Ligand binder design. Structure first.
Ligand SMILES: CC(=O)N[C@@H]1[C@@H](O[C@@H]2O[C@H](CO)[C@H](O)[C@H](O)[C@H]2O[C@@H]2O[C@@H](C)[C@@H](O)[C@@H](O)[C@@H]2O)[C@H](O[C@@H]2O[C@@H](C)[C@@H](O)[C@@H](O)[C@@H]2O)[C@@H](CO)O[C@H]1O
Ligand SMILES: CC(=O)N[C@@H]1[C@@H](O[C@@H]2O[C@H](CO)[C@H](O)[C@H](O)[C@H]2O[C@@H]2O[C@@H](C)[C@@H](O)[C@@H](O)[C@@H]2O)[C@H](O[C@@H]2O[C@@H](C)[C@@H](O)[C@@H](O)[C@@H]2O)[C@@H](CO)O[C@H]1O
Lengths: 309, 307
């Protein structure tokens, strides 16, 4: 009695943003997930607005890094000592897995590393790639490495930003073998256990699968696997964070409605810990009308049987 | 009537509606001497998108299409597609494709491409000069300068992801970008159409309140300041809520949770911009947890407490 009514945004899928990389959502996808552990750290939020993992609120502070850089002699690599979003000191003892927004998959993320010299406002920018499966990827410790197209242009002790664009793959190896979107980086480096993680999720009900919000990351070199699935759109993270409507049960029943025809396409379970399941067996790209949207209908529980998708 | 609200997200939790970067601060200054007519980040309080405004925080200053190499150069012409990768339609009554840059500047980022057949991919640093003669997005074409003469393929999906801005370092520092100069969306001899209107304070002692970011600089000595009239999250919020405006102005109070006190009040005009009572340039100093709260509908001629 007296709970703030729960709701989800009325934005359509194509009007929303992937919570794991700064690109629009394209489609909904469902498939079996017994062959991987689904434990992304971005795009994690409970329905009552508790951010989990490395999740933060900005759609354009995801897979970014800020700090200052040191050149590694004999190479085009730079070590970035990480700062916070507002350029303050990074605190490695905060009870999070890594700075909020840190990439949550193993892959080679390419973008631009940019810098401004405080004294005169001179600026510079270079193509750069961060290898999140590599030994120098230690964001939790406050340090990551970038491979760039320069050995001398970046200055020390000047604010430097990495803006992600897409992913690459080693073209001499099996096509689409990376990125591995369901493999978490080791945030503190090789053989150091991750901490404070958002939990892995899986369907529990017979005949159910996770429902993913899917985008295609830009590819920047080689033959990458560009598929990227998030559990919640970034706008849903922002919505629940603000609304903070109490979860009246374990499961919010949503209906996906077509306002063009006035008919419900399918129903799904939004679990209070922040993920969606549907009743379907097999890999399936959902086909949805551009104006279709999710609408909260009622609180049910994990024993509720969904109508087949 | 449906109660009007603004998001409770703090400034640094929100996104610039004119370039895909976080908001950093609030800024006010006089703007009588020139025209404030941005086309992105334009939305009425009852949720009507204006100008070139669309809903995505990460489909702003992006481009998509097919590219063709200009022989004897490292420049490529992009024939624009839509977000769904369909043919572009120049007869829509908009100034240019939604999300088109709304300032004159040299925007640098990466041009990326996927070959459909084998999934091979490529990516190159590229710059679009929105003040250049070939910048004709309303006509379905813009030009990029890149670092290759041969790597991009024809008739393959190509995307530009913006990162920051550059300036010609052999010229007066910070002389470009010019954030308050609109591109000529159809080229230099064709006037712009279907624009969201220019905005100005009219009430004595008031100035615009800007939501400000610093665009990354990628070369030279650029002016990196970028002011939007509404955070992108406010655009998304009004679009969904569609709460009718009960008067010309929504009075907002900016509240500090650490004290429980109002820091300042401002006017959110129903056509989608904010004013404060202040004379002079000022970077507002705000607590990280400060937020805007709608307090009441007032008329346009309400007198604000001084900022
Ligand atoms: C121009 C081209 O196709 N070159 C092939 C080469 O791929 C290029 O390799 C260099 C390093 O030597 C850079 O990594 C380039 O980014 C890369 O080219 C990109 O990727 C290829 C697949 C094309 O889509 C191209 O248009 C694009 O610019 C390739 O090298 C292998 O693959 C690359 C990605 C890299 O992992 C190399 O270490 C690896 O040996 C070789 C052999 O596959 O073939 C060249 O023709
Ligand atoms: C290495 C350096 O500082 N060079 C200055 C030069 O700037 C470089 O010019 C080339 C073009 O010839 C490229 O545009 C480079 O990106 C540019 O270097 C960038 O910008 C400078 C200001 C530094 O921050 C540097 O670290 C960064 O990589 C510069 O040339 C003027 O400005 C550039 C942006 C370009 O517009 C030139 O056409 C223009 O003459 C000159 C004069 O300011 O000074 C050199 O020292």
């Amino acid at each position: 009695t007296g709970s703030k009514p729960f709701t989800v945004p009325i934005l359509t899928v194509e009007e929303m943003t992937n919570s794991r990389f700064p690109i629009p959502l394209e489609k909904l996808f469902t498939g079996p997930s017994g062959a991987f552990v689904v434990q992304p750290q971005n795009g994690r939020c409970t329905t009552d607005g508790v951010l989990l993992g490395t999740t933060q609120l900005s759609p354009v502070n995801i897979c970014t890094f800020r700090g200052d850089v040191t050149h590694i002699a004999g190479s085009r690599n730079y070590t970035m000592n990480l700062a916070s979003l507002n350029w303050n000191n990074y605190d490695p003892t905060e009870e999070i897995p890594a700075p909020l927004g840190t990439p949550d998959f193993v892959g080679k993320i390419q973008g631009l590393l940019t810098q401004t010299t405080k004294g005169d406002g001179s600026t510079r920018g270079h193509k750069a790639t961060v290898y999140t499966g590599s030994a120098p990827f230690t964001p939790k410790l406050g340090s990551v490495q970038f491979s760039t197209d320069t050995e001398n242009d970046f200055e020390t002790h000047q604010n430097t930003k990495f803006t992600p664009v897409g992913v690459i793959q080693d073209g001499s190896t099996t096509h689409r073998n990376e990125p591995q979107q369901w493999v978490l980086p080791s945030y503190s480096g090789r053989n150091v256990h991750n901490v404070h993680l958002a939990p892995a999720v899986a369907p529990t009900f017979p005949g159910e699968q996770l429902l993913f919000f899917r985008s295609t990351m830009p590819g920047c070199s080689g033959y990458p696997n560009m598929d990227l699935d998030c559990l919640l759109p970034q706008e849903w993270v922002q919505h629940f964070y603000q609304e903070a409507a109490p979860a009246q049960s374990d499961v919010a029943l949503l209906r996906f409605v077509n306002p063009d025809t006035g008919r419900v396409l399918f129903e799904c379970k939004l679990h209070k810990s922040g993920y969606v399941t549907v009743a379907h067996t097999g890999q399936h790209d959902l086909v949805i009308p551009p104006n279709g949207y999710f609408r909260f209908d009622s609180w049910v529980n994990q024993f509720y049987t969904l109508a087949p998708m």
